[PDB]
Write a protein that binds this ligand. Structure first.
Ligand code: SAH
Ligand code: SAH
Lengths: 220, 220
């Protein structure tokens, strides 16, 4: 099945996504730096870019930078004078991400903050940051419950929240699993349901990265 | 396999989509009337509703009504004096859709036009309809090329176009397919690539309806 899903994704990108030497280099540098290949796929990246454009987002919060691949897709969807604030725990990942954001000529609208996301989120609250209108949660999924609460806290009515990798090859329905990622993801779904101010759905996806999925939520 | 995808969708729906007796009735009536089970899934329907809300769409065009299941999800995403115009070739389907839409108390927001979509689209242009901000193509896929051209013609900068069922169990990559629906979808991808005014991506999805996918495009 992975061969078929990968072939379909190759077809989709070949026809709908013009070759982009900049983004290809980002992945190449990530690999050279030994960063894991956990970036969103090209089709997922374009989905994010287009969703940002549909929302007309101007203040994006991303949790989990890696090498800035998703960050570039997101930043490219920004309105006028919008910006992206992305959080990364690894000093090395963050350094590489900054270099890739530089190679994409987006350093004028993207800020990479190094440190554990929970600590950075508190700092963001402490500082004078306007509410975020688009939030992409893509870090350590075991912490999704806390990231969701922070996302809502730092949101405004109409804010879009995308939570990546929330199906995990179907492990999401294994209620007895002792895996913290699975339990964290399940609590993420539950907390969204508990919040009357948030309405969401989740689509299961397949492609070059395998069988997974994402949550798309909107703050009332 | 399909068992896992179905179970995951059941989980997602159970937690994120509150029970809706109105929509349950809609599907029951569609089935009693022997309509094919081609309605979007509940999670796909909510995805459409949320996307409509994110864009803040006010004038929706849907091609392919069936029993009005997707139509209701779309209409529920509207707010002010928003409207939905949906096209259906089957007189029987159209009347069942009008009935379901009425039971959902949305007849004031939805217009179901009976007839071949290509004929109705010409009429819509002839008439003074305002440009459509959101277009859902979900009828006979062999005609997607023509529907895409009409969508572009009746759009405005920023219009969102969603094309459903564009992966079809992975057959979309088979250029030699004897399925006119597969050829129609391939023609659709190609035309999008040939239209500079449209940027798109496609995500492959799995769930209760099986392995398929959708295209999301934005008009520039
Ligand atoms: N507690 C935490 N705070 C911030 N980043 C964290 C974290 N735990 C893990 N991460 C970071 O989560 C990232 C997940 S991969 C991020 C990929 C990126 N969104 C893309 O599309 O390419 C990694 O870079 C990892 O170092
Ligand atoms: N040429 C044409 N013009 C208009 N509708 C057409 C058509 N060819 C097929 N259809 C209609 O396409 C519909 C596809 S199923 C539509 C389902 C609907 N989107 C939902 O989510 O519930 C059927 O009702 C079929 O009768």
């Amino acid at each position: 099945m992975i061969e078929t899903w990968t072939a379909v994704d190759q077809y989709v990108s070949d026809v709908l996504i013009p070759k982009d030497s900049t983004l290809e280099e980002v992945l190449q540098v990530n690999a050279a730096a030994n960063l894991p290949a956990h970036d969103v796929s090209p089709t997922q990246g374009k989905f994010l870019q287009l969703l940002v454009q549909i929302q007309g987002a101007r203040n994006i919060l991303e949790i989990g930078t890696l090498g800035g691949y998703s960050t570039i897709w997101l930043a490219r969807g920004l309105s006028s004078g919008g910006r992206v604030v992305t959080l990364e725990a690894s000093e090395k990942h963050a350094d590489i991400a900054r270099s890739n954001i530089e190679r994409a000529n987006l350093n004028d609208r993207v800020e990479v903050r190094t440190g554990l996301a929970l600590d950075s989120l508190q700092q963001i609250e402490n500082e004078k940051y306007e509410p975020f209108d688009f939030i992409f949660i893509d870090a350590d999924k075991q912490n999704n419950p806390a990231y969701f609460e922070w996302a809502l806290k730092l949101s405004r009515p109409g804010t879009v929240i995308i939570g990546d990798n929330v199906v995990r090859e179907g492990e999401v329905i294994d209620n007895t699993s002792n895996d913290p990622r699975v339990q964290g993801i399940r609590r993420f779904y539950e907390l969204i349901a508990a919040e009357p101010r948030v309405s969401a759905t989740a689509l299961q996806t397949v492609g070059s990265k395998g069988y997974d999925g994402f949550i798309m939520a909107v703050v009332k």
